[PDB]
């Protein structure tokens, strides 16, 4: 079934994907803290910061990634940022959701001072990943695949990045044939979602303009990773 080295690499990616969590302090606030546009928003900012924290730490561990040129490491990180976050978010919302929590989070998201035109496609996409009751390793691999696009802007050496993404794609494909042997389109169904995930790069870039009214000045990490002002 799975090559000896492919498994050597899949273990390596799991040992980084499963290392990281959303903190107690943060998931409590979803229950604990008071409700309103100000506090609900203020919570979402903390989560988003947490995802960048987690994104980064995942990224640095991806095998090969340290050999990449420093500028290209940055480019990748900022390019993949928004997609990685929508993807972590979904799977925080679909799997690590004591059901009461995820309902309260839905309420809080829908009264965050953010508008439907953004909220609705987010929840759409969640539900869409919902079907394909994705597994632990499916998310870790996609995330690594999303992070290592040769497609992103400002990369010098696309060839080096392509050669890092391709082993991973193989592993995934060979993974679909093992946990979904009855359904041979599965691997495609996945990258189909990976396409509607890139839709969100426009949503995000727009959404910064809309909400930048009322002057937040997000925490330093979101400031730097989203590249605002």
């Amino acid at each position: 079934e799975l090559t000896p080295d492919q498994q050597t690499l899949l273990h390596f990616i799991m040992d980084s994907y499963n290392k990281q969590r959303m903190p107690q302090e943060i998931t409590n606030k979803i229950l604990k803290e008071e409700f309103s546009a100000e506090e609900n928003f203020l919570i979402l900012t903390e989560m988003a910061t947490n995802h960048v924290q987690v994104l980064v730490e995942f990224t640095k561990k991806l095998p090969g990634f340290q050999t990449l040129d420093h500028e290209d490491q940055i480019a990748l990180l900022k390019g993949s940022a928004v997609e990685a976050m929508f993807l972590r978010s979904a799977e925080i919302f679909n799997k690590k959701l004591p059901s009461g929590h995820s309902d309260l989070l839905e309420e809080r998201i829908r009264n965050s001072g953010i508008s439907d035109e953004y909220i609705t496609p987010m929840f759409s996409f969640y539900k869409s990943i919902g079907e394909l009751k994705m597994t632990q390793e499916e998310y870790a691999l996609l995330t690594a695949i999303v992070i290592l696009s040769p497609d992103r802007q400002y990369i010098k050496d696309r060839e080096a990045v392509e050669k890092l993404q391709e082993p991973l794609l193989d592993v995934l494909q060979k993974l679909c044939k093992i946990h979904q042997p009855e359904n041979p389109q599965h691997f495609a169904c996945l990258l189909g979602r990976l396409t509607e995930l890139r839709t969100f790069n426009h949503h995000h870039a727009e959404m910064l303009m809309s909400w930048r009214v009322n002057d937040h000045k997000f925490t330093p990490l979101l400031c730097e990773i989203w590249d605002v002002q």
Binding site: K60, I74, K78
Partner: peptide, 11 residues
């Protein structure tokens, strides 16, 4: 240069 991200990637 992005000091914050270099900082986090090299930690």
């Amino acid at each position: 240069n992005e000091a914050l991200l270099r900082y986090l990637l090299d930690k």
